């Protein structure tokens, strides 16, 4: 998953995320009461020397039964206003985010690929 | 087989004797009103109980596959 450090793959078309950079995009903070960040959990990602909130959509940590375990950590950038930074998401995104507590409709609308 | 299925975990190892009593929580203050007040007497045999007793929400085996419609 994504946590302190834990270099993640930025699945977004945001300018900072889309542009290649020599240092990988790591995380600085997890926006949850617990310290562990999983799918649907807001995080304080770092991109192009800037701090941008990201939403986790996949993790490599073993999950509950009847669920697919991702082989890579995927995140989606979210603006301060709450709208996603990027207008599209490339990696398939689980549809459980809809039922997850929080505001996920905007990201799901931007996520064309659903598994 | 006089087996009771209870939610949650019970302290101790398997095959360990335990003491069972009615819930003392305030919410379930008086549940014995609708239950056998002293106890259930099979000797009376007013009505033979089914071999397996199920809760309404419980899905019995051999039922149709649950579809989330």
């Amino acid at each position: 998953a994504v946590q302190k450090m834990t270099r993640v793959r930025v699945v977004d078309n945001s300018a900072l995320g889309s542009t290649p950079y020599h240092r990988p995009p790591r995380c600085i903070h997890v926006y949850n009461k617990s310290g562990v960040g999983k799918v649907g959990d807001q995080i304080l990602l770092a991109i192009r020397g800037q701090k941008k909130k990201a939403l986790i959509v996949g993790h490599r940590m073993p999950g509950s039964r009847m669920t697919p375990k991702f082989d890579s950590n995927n995140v989606v950038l979210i603006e301060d206003n709450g709208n996603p930074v990027g207008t599209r998401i490339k990696i398939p995104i689980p549809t459980s985010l809809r039922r997850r507590e929080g505001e996920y409709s905007k990201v799901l609308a931007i996520a064309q690929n659903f598994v | 087989h006089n087996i009771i299925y209870v939610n949650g975990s019970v302290p101790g190892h398997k095959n360990c004797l335990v003491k069972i009593k009615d819930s003392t929580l305030p919410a379930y203050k008086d549940s014995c009103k609708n239950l056998p007040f002293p106890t259930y007497f099979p000797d009376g045999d007013e009505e033979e109980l089914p071999e397996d007793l199920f809760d309404e929400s419980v899905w019995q085996p051999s039922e149709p596959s649950i579809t989330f419609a």
Binding site: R98 | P64, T67, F68
Partner: protein, 217 residues
């Protein structure tokens, strides 16, 4: 006579009566939902009710990589690569929300566990979701795929080269020198192959279970 793994009880102090009750429910459920015979390495398509969606079922296709659990709680895992993403889903055999089970391709692989396929090349793990079922022969053993997969660079999830794993489906020669294998072989523990304290026999239990299962039918 194919006895499914879940029916075989494991060694322990668990009450036999639990297995007897569990088997009856499993047999009763098998009537409602038919559980096809399959082995690790077989590609299966399983239909399950979707909780997030309303009144919509989905079918997922993947190669069976591992079988775990016993009794009503037994589960099976099938692996596939979708949109370039390796995905493994664990399905419980007797879960009420599994509408149907279809064995698209019934086959066996060299090893009983295919966790090393994650370290193998993606193509060995890629399977078309829409691939149609292939014919099978009833009075025969399941086809055994003897293809040896090629591994990715040396850093792996587990040290498959070690004799303990004894993986027979890996092309170690291509990625590992014979000297490296000898280094791995230093953990041979040859007495383990000859130690009878680690042996658990279920043949008698398996044979006894067969008649009981057939009797219920």
């Amino acid at each position: 006579r194919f006895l499914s793994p879940e029916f075989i009880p494991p060694r322990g102090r668990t009450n036999p009566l639990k297995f007897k009750i569990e088997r009856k429910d499993m047999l009763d459920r098998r009537k409602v939902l038919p559980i096809p015979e399959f082995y690790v390495g077989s590609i299966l398509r399983v239909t399950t009710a979707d909780p997030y969606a309303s009144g919509k079922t989905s079918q997922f296709l993947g190669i069976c990589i591992k079988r775990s659990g016993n009794g009503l709680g037994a589960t099976f895992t099938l692996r596939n690569t979708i949109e370039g993403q390796g995905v493994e889903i664990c399905f419980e055999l007797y879960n009420p929300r599994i509408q149907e089970i279809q064995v698209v391709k019934l086959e066996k692989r060299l090893d009983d566990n295919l966790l090393y396929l994650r370290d193998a090349l993606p193509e060995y793990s890629t399977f078309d979701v829409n691939m149609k079922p292939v014919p099978q022969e009833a009075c025969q053993e399941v086809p055994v795929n003897k293809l040896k997969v090629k591994m990715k660079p040396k850093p792996w999830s587990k040290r498959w080269e070690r004799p303990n794993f004894n993986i027979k489906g890996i092309r170690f020669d291509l990625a590992l020198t014979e000297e490296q294998m000898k280094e791995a072989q230093k953990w041979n523990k040859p007495w383990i192959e000859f130690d009878m304290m680690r042996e658990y026999d279920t043949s008698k239990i398996e044979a006894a279970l067969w008649e009981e299962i057939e009797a219920s039918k």
